[PDB]
Design a protein around this ligand. Structure first.
Ligand code: 1WN
Ligand code: ZN
Ligand code: ZN
Ligand code: ZN
Length: 296
């Protein structure tokens, strides 16, 4: 059978919050079967736990924020993207502040931590959510869709008209039958438009952002000296972001996500809309791994 997966060891890192600019301590820990990913604010007294589930998402402007009452954990999407990519079902994530550290802007540092912690198979079947019917949500010209697919595929199209994007692919469809999340998606850095970052900074926001943790473009050029990690890094990051949001379903997906100019708000609307319609999905397990359309 395909088994649930957790970490073998506790592991730690530090970094700064993209929004706050202040140092945060991160800890990833093993967790029992059927725990899911649970975030804990260990700086608070009492300590506050927030399960990484779609129903606990509050704000979704630019980042995905988990909320419980007045307590928040911001910017969960890149870490969760790594958890999803490596098929980690169960883990505890401890944080000394209200935001996951931005690290290098990608999911790579989290992939690194999870792999370094080691992968532990657990004595319970891994559950998957299989999409049975296509479901979509829209806002203006933005669209996010789940489509049935015998495997796991994430497709995305961005549609920027600024000169710096002219001639760029702005589209990718990744079938994880033959694409490595680790090698080909996880290291895509977050990006921002210079004018938008200036606006954030003018309000004392985005204080942790730098060219060392984000690709910054003006109307016409990429500001980062070293260029891009992947030829299509921008759309790959959107794919990364979508995989992280997808993991808030609480189980790995058998299906396809398609994004069109979509962001965290629409991604989360899609999750809640899917979850609510039981005719459109089912939970499956694989007692024989060789018969499965995915592999971890
Ligand atoms: C990628 C993302 O999805 C997104 C969402 C909306 C959008 O319009 C574009 C990108 C969205 N991006 C961010 O929220 C984002 C990305 C970059 C920054 C920044 C910065 C900086 C800086 C800096 C640069 C130069 C100097 N000299 C100093 C400081 C802030 C936030 C994302 O990745 N969310 O998961
Ligand atoms: Zn423009
Ligand atoms: Zn992102
Ligand atoms: Zn909704």
């Amino acid at each position: 059978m395909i088994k649930q997966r957790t970490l073998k060891n506790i592991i730690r890192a530090t970094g700064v919050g993209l929004h706050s600019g202040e140092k945060v301590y991160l800890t990833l820990k093993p967790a029992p079967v059927d725990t899911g990913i649970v975030f804990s604010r260990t700086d608070l007294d009492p300590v506050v736990e927030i399960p990484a589930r779609a129903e606990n998402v509050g704000e979704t402007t630019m980042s995905t924020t988990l909320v419980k009452g007045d307590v928040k954990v911001d910017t969960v999407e890149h870490l969760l993207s790594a958890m999803a990519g490596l098929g980690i079902d169960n883990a505890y994530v401890e944080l000394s502040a209200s935001e996951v550290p931005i690290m290098d802007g990608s999911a790579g540092p989290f992939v690194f931590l999870i792999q370094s912690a080691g992968l532990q198979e657990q004595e319970a079947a891994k559950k998957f959510i299989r999409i049975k019917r296509e479901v979509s949500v829209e806002e203006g010209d933005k669209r996010a869709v789940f489509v049935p697919f015998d495997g796991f595929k994430v497709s995305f199209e961005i549609d920027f008209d600024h000169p710096v994007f002219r001639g760029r692919t702005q589209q990718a469809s990744v079938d994880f039958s033959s694409t490595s999340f680790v090698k080909e998606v996880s290291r895509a850095r977050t990006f921002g438009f210079m004018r938008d970052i200036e606006y954030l900074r003018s309000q004392n926001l985005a204080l942790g952002g730098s060219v060392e943790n984000a690709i910054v473009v003006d109307e016409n050029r990429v500001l980062n000296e070293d260029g891009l990690r992947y030829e299509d890094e921008f759309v790959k990051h959107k794919i990364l972001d979508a995989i992280g949001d997808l993991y808030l379903l609480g189980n790995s997906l058998i299906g396809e996500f398609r994004g069109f100019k979509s962001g965290h708000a629409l991604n989360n609307q899609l999750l809640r809309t899917l979850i609510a319609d039981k005719d459109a999905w089912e939970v499956v397990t694989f007692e024989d791994a060789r018969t499965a359309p995915i592999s971890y």
